[PDB]
Amino acid sequence: KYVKVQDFYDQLGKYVLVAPGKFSGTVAATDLSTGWTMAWLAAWNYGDTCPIMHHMAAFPSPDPYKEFEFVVNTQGGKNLFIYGVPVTVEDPGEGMKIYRIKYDGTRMNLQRDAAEVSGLGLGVHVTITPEADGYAVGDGQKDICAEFDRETDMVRYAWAFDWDPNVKDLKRAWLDGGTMTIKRLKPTLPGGRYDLQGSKGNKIDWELVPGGELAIEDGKVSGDRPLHSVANDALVFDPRGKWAVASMRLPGVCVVFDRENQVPVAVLAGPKGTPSQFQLVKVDDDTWTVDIPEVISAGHQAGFSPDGQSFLFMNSLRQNNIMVWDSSNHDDPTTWEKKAVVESPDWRGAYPNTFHMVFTPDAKKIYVTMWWPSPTPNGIAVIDAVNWEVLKEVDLGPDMHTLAITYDGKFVVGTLSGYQNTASAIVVMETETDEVLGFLPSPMGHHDNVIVPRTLEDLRISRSTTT
């Protein structure tokens, strides 16, 4: 006579959802096979005085129900004052922590803050190495990204980026082009520790929200050095190994790095109307530069298809599209050539922004979140990744963030997050015919989510190759 919600869960598989809660100050794991929250953690319990739990990624576990490990970072300072919420906190913590947490089959356990171990605090995207032997974090206030060792939480390499605008004026600093410096960032304290915890290193006093390139150009973003900003977001991994790619929002480029040899090798040019690449220029053993005549649009970077045949960058605002490179040549990223642009008549405005993504296992389809300011419904675009065309767009609700996929490729699991003060939820869409199956409650402001991987292969469609 009645509908049992267990019928719904039974179809989804034995998969563990995990998501951080931004202004909620919490992180939680959900058993998609029963509807239960498996465990949750509230960072205030651990003396965190600004627990804006931002991005996260989970290491593969042979059985997530028995144990898994993940990394979740935080933001602080003036980031608390940027959303609809009329916060009253007199001395907010500086954030930039990088928490290591273990789910032990019962509870979450805080292991340590890797930003205390390493000395390097970073507050934007978190990713796992395809070898699951490490992770990487980027930050758009300090414009630094690094890869860390999983066992020691020490930095393997760190890169710092800087902008030298042709026109020394915030309105023109990126439109009229400039030179970005890529610099090896080396520790300064005993035990090879950085002195870059919390706010140390910040060029701007908060992260740029969606459309923040207008904000920083309009002088609406305070900081000691906003003319030097490039707004690094992420370091994502070629699933085939060897390379990692850092995105830079304001100059509208990506930098391909040799992981092991600790050098940049190529610069991918984001906007439609640019060549495939810009010329990388070595200045000395630790310093490279790239000249960018004009920045046509800011962008956000997407990441690799699961076979590493394709690499994708989102242009944002001035252009809204998905730029696509042929990355088939694993030997030499300087040969990576533009092969498609995903466009739509619906993307001609300032919004929606092409935001985050997840590929199906076979690389044939992508699911892409489409972001708008309140009150326009955000939703998901379904992309044919063979022909590079939009197949379908579905309206869902306010403030769409990230997507993950069950590893059998059957269901996409997305986060809607209420701009931190209104409706939020988990959405589940089936990928066979692309229908929205409905929503689950989620009293959190997630800017991330993962399903815990089992294998290194699973990581190819997790928080490793894409954000």
Added chain:
Amino acid sequence: KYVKVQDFYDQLGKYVLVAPGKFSGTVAATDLSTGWTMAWLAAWNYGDTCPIMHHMAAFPSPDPYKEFEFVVNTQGGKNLFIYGVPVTVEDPGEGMKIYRIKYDGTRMNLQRDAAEVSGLGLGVHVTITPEADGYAVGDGQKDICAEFDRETDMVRYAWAFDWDPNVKDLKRAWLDGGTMTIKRLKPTLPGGRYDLQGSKGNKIDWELVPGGELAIEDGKVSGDRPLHSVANDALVFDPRGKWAVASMRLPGVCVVFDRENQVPVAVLAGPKGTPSQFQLVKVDDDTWTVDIPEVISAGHQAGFSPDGQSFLFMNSLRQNNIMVWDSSNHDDPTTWEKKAVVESPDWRGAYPNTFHMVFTPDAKKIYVTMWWPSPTPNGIAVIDAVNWEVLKEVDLGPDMHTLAITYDGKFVVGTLSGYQNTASAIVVMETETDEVLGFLPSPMGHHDNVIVPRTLEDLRISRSTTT
């Protein structure tokens, strides 16, 4: 072919669930017709240093989806150290805040702290008056309860309780009886304010946990005055008006109060084998005593059936049962006589206990929670409230707390809360055949939940008449 979860929600109707999250430091409202969280609020955002979000009740609204108001309180101090979380904040905020929040159709808005307005902080149960013109909070650390005005947040009346044991040793303080004093509490500061915020007034350093009556007896509960504790839990309301009833856990009695005339009128005796009542004695205009010759069990849950015909008190631990009084005579509570005890051959351990309940609208059935420490399954017992017998028990999961019911009587909606560190969920149970329909994720440590009522009549089976 795929099952939609929307099918599950369609059946539930247009009802809004609200629950706070204890250690999560959050409160959230969920739309049972779609699965969305409508809004959530993190008290750390407002500078709360110990946001243990504890009890709540919601005022009726003609359309909860357009707007509703609720009250949610907090606990602080050594309550942060009670649960199995290895908290690191050694000197937490003191809690005892009484937050007024409005859901405005879009977001939750923090209105104010009624404890700051009135000067009275109280940390245990919150209930709404049956007229919806006010609210009540009780507290078991300071042994105070009060009824507050909804517009002004000022105290209408406050009562303080104190224990004078026959035997001056914690082992025998309650078992060997004593005299409980009931004292009218008057404002002591200008503009009609109390000096009783935060820890001011506390006799003990944390709210007694379940079985806590043993710990206090064994000298395991720190405080300046545990020998004089009664552990007030709540002040619940006669749905017929006029009367309010305070529950006292350690002496196992409830005190019935005339709300408008601001005097106690009757003391009901909890344990099986004691008379219906003990004798209330007037000492002066502000002071009553009652002699209790021995205390054979502590007790806890007290409330009314929705027609006010029956009043119930739960005995816990030494005895586990439900004591029932004939409260049909609304003119004179001193006439309220015991009519039944709900007992069960499965309730002979020290656990399960029975800490919460909800009636069906016709008063024919009760849903009651059955609490055990980890790891024994907690769940729901269904009680025939015509014959006073257990119909059924269902096992559900860890740490069951409160229950609410949809106002059409169709669905009981309950909270499981992980002891603050393991699995938590919302459970849905239909009342026609008393089958569990399943679980929804809820990353919160809830010790309370309501469905937002629309009418005064709906309030009779919400957080007004029972806990």
